[PDB]
Symmetry: C6
């Protein structure tokens, strides 16, 4: 699995996330207008966070952040939260990522994640189709 | 395999079921209006139970509970029962789940289940197509 | 592989068949009007026999018994026989199942079966298409 | 891989062929009008010979003998021969099967066969399409 | 992978090529008008050479020599050469096959071949599409 | 995976790139007008560089350099750079390839590459679709 990022403006930032028990931020790369980034989901990276006006293009389709197994989340309005639920005998929220308007999160189901919870006004995409919370 | 749950109202409840010889209830998660839950079928979870007005979306299609290998069951009217039949030399009902109107059950065929029996007025979906008991 | 059975009347009976050298009957389950049965082909079960007015639905399509690798046989008229031919150096009929009108038999090719013989007026379905003896 | 045989007349005969170095005839089964035979290609059987008015139905399509990796040969006129060429360092004809008008031969590529030669007026079918010698 | 050869004239010749470090000619078979040859690519044979008026039919499509991973080469005019480039740390031409008008070469990428070079007026076919040098 | 190169002019040059920690140039082959080159991505070669008027044809489609998992880059204007980002715990640019106008680079994601960065005016193609930086 892999995705594409194109920047419609300067300052677009792409964050990496660590795979495993610990969910922390992997140092980021900056994209200027016209620059393109193509990346895969690897052993060390299982999720990413995209901030700024950008074109995100994946196997499911194309997304425009400026306009109003793995899955995609887009924030229609500040206050969106994504919870990761632990795989195994116990179910608990081991990570809570906050998404601001225009931010996009791409994540996979991992050894430590088998379920997630999304809150607030957001756009969600999946292999089967797209879903709107509002 | 994975599914999607969206809540059209507050109080929507999603139950997990234990995989193995014992069929009991796995502690549940609550969803408010606009919240979304994406989950997989795992080693410890092989079936789920959904209660309340919700949009259930799977590989086979989309279901609306409010309106009138794995499979889906929806209850058109109280009194629906789902029996699990034991895999192996002997065939017996090792579990009997009751479904009320609007409740949806998503289950897989497991090491301990190779056949099920559905009773009453219900809507059933499968990879091959949809089926109505009435 | 799995199939679906729905009953259009009371008294519908579904028989299981033992996989292996011995071909005998596995104790049956009864279905009333509106009841649905979903079952797989397993290590111990490799064929089934369906009797009564029912809707049989499989990967190949849907069958109605009331109207006039694995395969399906339906009897248009009493006197239909299905012979199982032994896999290996020798070819002999190790089992002879009789089908009455409206009865449906679903069977797979197994370690002990690599060829079958059908006699009389019957309807046959396969992955490639449907066939009528008459 | 498997095929279907239906008889449009009495006396239809189906021959089996031995897989391995030796290519000889496996004792045959007889089909009367309306009888159907469904068989697979197995360790001991890798080719068959069909004689008489019959409907031969395979993954590639349906054939009518009466009218004017594996492959199919039909004889439009007596004198058709099928040669089997040895797999390995040497290429020689280790078997020569003669086909009369209306006879159909279904064969696979085996450990001992990697090429065949067809002579005379015949109809040939393959996964990619059909071919006529005349 | 396998191909089909049909002869539109007498004297059609099919050559085999040895797989491995050494690229030499494998003794040939002759085809008369109406004769058909079906062959596979094997451990010992990885390429073939076809000479004369013939119908060559493959997974990609059908070719007519008389008219004006694996690949196909056809010569529109004498002087066509096909070079085989060595797989590994070094790149060198270990074989140079000459093709006359109407001759067709079918070859695979092997342990010793990972790249080829074609010169002159020729027609080339591949899984993705057809290509003309002129 | 494999690609096709055809030359619309003399002097077209194709460069190979070494797979592994070290990213250096593999000695090149020259193509004259009408010549065709078909090559695979191998253990020792994971990327190529194409210079001159040529037709590049791949699984995704056909490209014309003269006109204005693996991916393709084309330069609309001098100054295009492609950075390779290291797979593993650390992210750094271990190689920076410069592309002039009309030059085309075809590269795969390898054990040492899991992400790339493209700068300037360029055309990018991927399995999912095409992308333009301008
Ligand atoms: N470390 C987590 C990262 C992760 C995966 N999916 C997520 C969903 C939400 C938040 C974090 C995650 C994991 O590999 O499982
Ligand atoms: N720990 C649970 C998480 C889970 C999976 N599916 C669920 C459905 C509902 C609630 C929790 C879950 C498991 O891996 O099985
Ligand atoms: N513990 C059971 C759960 C189950 C699977 N399918 C079912 C159908 C009905 C009721 C329970 C189940 C199992 O893993 O087999
Ligand atoms: N114990 C049986 C259950 C079963 C499978 N298929 C059936 C069909 C009908 C009745 C029972 C069954 C088995 O695993 O084989
Ligand atoms: N015991 C038999 C059952 C069977 C399979 N296919 C059949 C066809 C006809 C009659 C019986 C069978 C077997 O496993 O091989
Ligand atoms: N015992 C034979 C059965 C068989 C296979 N294909 C056939 C075709 C015709 C008659 C018998 C057969 C075998 O396994 O090879
Ligand atoms: N014994 C031969 C049978 C055979 C296969 N393909 C054939 C084609 C023609 C004649 C015989 C055959 C084999 O297994 O190889
Ligand atoms: N003995 C040869 C047979 C063969 C394969 N492909 C061919 C093409 C032409 C002639 C003979 C052959 C081999 O296995 O390689
Ligand atoms: N002996 C060579 C034969 C070959 C394969 N592809 C070719 C292309 C051109 C010429 C010869 C070949 C090999 O197996 O690799
Ligand atoms: N020896 C080289 C051959 C090669 C592959 N791809 C190429 C592209 C261009 C030139 C040569 C090559 C290799 O196996 O890697
Ligand atoms: N040696 C590098 C070559 C490479 C792959 N992808 C690239 C992208 C850009 C530049 C170089 C590369 C590798 O195998 O990983
Ligand atoms: N070293 C990182 C590279 C990487 C993968 N995906 C990314 C997304 C953004 C930034 C860097 C990355 C890894 O293999 O996981």
């Amino acid at each position: 699995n892999f995705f594409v990022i194109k920047a419609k403006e300067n300052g677009v930032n792409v964050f990496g996330m660590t795979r495993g028990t610990d969910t922390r931020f992997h140092h980021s790369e900056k994209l200027d207008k016209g620059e393109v980034m193509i990346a895969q989901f690897t052993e060390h990276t299982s999720a990413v966070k995209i901030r700024g006006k950008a074109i995100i293009q994946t196997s499911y389709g194309t997304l425009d952040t400026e306009k109003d197994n793995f899955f995609v989340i887009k924030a229609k309005e500040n206050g969106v939260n994504v919870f990761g639920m632990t795989r195994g005998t116990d179910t608990r929220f081991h990570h809570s990522e906050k998404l601001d308007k225009g931010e996009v999160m791409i994540a996979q189901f991992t050894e430590h994640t088998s379920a997630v919870k999304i809150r607030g006004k957001a756009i969600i995409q999946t292999s089967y189709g797209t879903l709107d919370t509002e």
